Design a protein around this ligand. Structure first.
Ligand SMILES: [Zn+2]
Length: 38
């Protein structure tokens, strides 16, 4: 399981969402912006 580039823009999985960041952690947090409700 090679990686090569070892770093690419992660496009949010959420359908429609156009959020992408070179950071993995940051993304994980963003994925919460959708499933976030009081
Ligand atoms: Zn998103």
């Amino acid at each position: 399981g090679s990686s090569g580039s070892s770093g690419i823009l992660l496009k949010c999985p959420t359908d429609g969402c156009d959020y992408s960041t070179p950071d993995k952690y940051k993304l994980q947090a963003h994925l919460k912006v959708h499933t976030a409700l009081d």
